[PDB]
């Protein structure tokens, strides 16, 4: 709200939107860029947000500010966009910040789910997949929320270097984020004895 | 607590249907 | 906000409202139903919300979706109500579950 | 989790600049 000689936030709606699979593959992993728009399903509605309420553009992912004992991160925008002043009016401003975070993930027996460093639960087995009978592993999400890419080469966002050895990349779109990790067979990877 | 609260939409809502 | 060829959430206000004692006794325990309206005191104001912004009705409580290692739950609505499209307008929609 | 989540603005945003 733009009053006389002062401005006040009537509201700040903050949301986390998953990056679609095609954007993770074609834009982030291939070119190190994100779309300036966020199009996603929230509250049973398809919603589209435009950064600075402008047309869609490709924006470069840059390293986040260094923090102690913190993993690597990248983002596109560091400033929040607020609407320009118009006196005696309520105005709205949209900020879209594409964020990529390398995180540690932990799973306890029987490994039907795992957690991320952010504290977000993923209700899918870390070993879920399409091969070696891993399709029988637990999943809570719909089939279209999961994707598995064979022969995936990870391109580093900082050094811009393509990975030498391919991996099997699991991608899962939760309602808040998309999580990608390397698929490995369960039996050689975990044990109940140490 | 985090596990049970973050299951709220999976139990009481629908996260896939688009009206 | 309903723009042209796109819609965007300007805001999503989320609240948890207590079920009054008489509703717990007479409706939920006696008939397994809930009122479609939430009338409660929030921020020193009596606020009333109507599901889908419609008249008050009695809605059956149905079992929640099964999850592993979770206790029993019941709810009335599984879909969030959003206002119908009207171009170049901000519209509000209420969901009471 | 609290430590890493409360560093979010100090990593991905700017808390000082006034437009």
From Swiss-Prot, chain A:
It is found in: Virion membrane; Host cell membrane; Host endosome membrane; Host Golgi apparatus membrane. Disulfide bonds join 34-98. It comes from the Viruses. Residues 1-6, 85-92 are annotated as: Involved in fusion and/or binding to host membrane. Homotrimer; disulfide-linked. Binds to heparan sulfate proteoglycans. Interacts with gH/gL heterodimer. Belongs to the herpesviridae glycoprotein B family. Envelope glycoprotein that forms spikes at the surface of virion envelope. Essential for the initial attachment to heparan sulfate moieties of the host cell surface proteoglycans. Involved in fusion of viral and cellular membranes leading to virus entry into the host cell. Following initial binding to its host receptors, membrane fusion is mediated by the fusion machinery composed at least of gB and the heterodimer gH/gL. May be involved in the fusion between the virion envelope and the outer nuclear membrane during virion egress. This is Envelope glycoprotein B. The lineage of its organism: Viruses, Duplodnaviria, Heunggongvirae, Peploviricota, Herviviricetes.
């Amino acid at each position: 709200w733009f009053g006389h000689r002062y401005s006040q936030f009537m509201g700040i709606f903050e949301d986390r939107a998953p990056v679609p699979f095609e954007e993770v593959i074609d834009k982030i992993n291939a070119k190190g860029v994100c779309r300036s728009t966020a199009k996603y399903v929230r509250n049973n509605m398809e919603t589209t947000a435009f950064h600075r309420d402008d047309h869609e553009t490709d924006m470069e992912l840059k390293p986040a500010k260094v923090a102690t004992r913190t993993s690597r991160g990248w983002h596109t925008t560091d400033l929040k966009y607020n609407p320009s002043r118009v006196e005696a009016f309520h105005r709205y401003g949209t900020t879209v910040n594409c964020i990529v975070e390398e995180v540690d993930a932990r799973s306890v027996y029987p490994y039907d789910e795992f957690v991320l460093a952010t504290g977000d639960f993923v209700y899918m087995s870390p070993f879920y997949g399409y091969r070696e009978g891993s399709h029988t592993e637990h999943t809570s999400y719909a089939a279209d929320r999961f994707k598995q890419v064979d022969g995936f080469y990870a391109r580093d966002l900082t050094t811009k270097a393509r990975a030498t050895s391919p991996t099997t990349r699991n991608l899962l779109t939760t309602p808040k984020f998309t999580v990608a990790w390397d698929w490995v067979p369960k039996r050689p990877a975990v044990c109940t004895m140490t | 607590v985090q596990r049970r609260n973050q299951l709220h939409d999976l139990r009481f809502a629908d996260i896939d249907t688009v009206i």
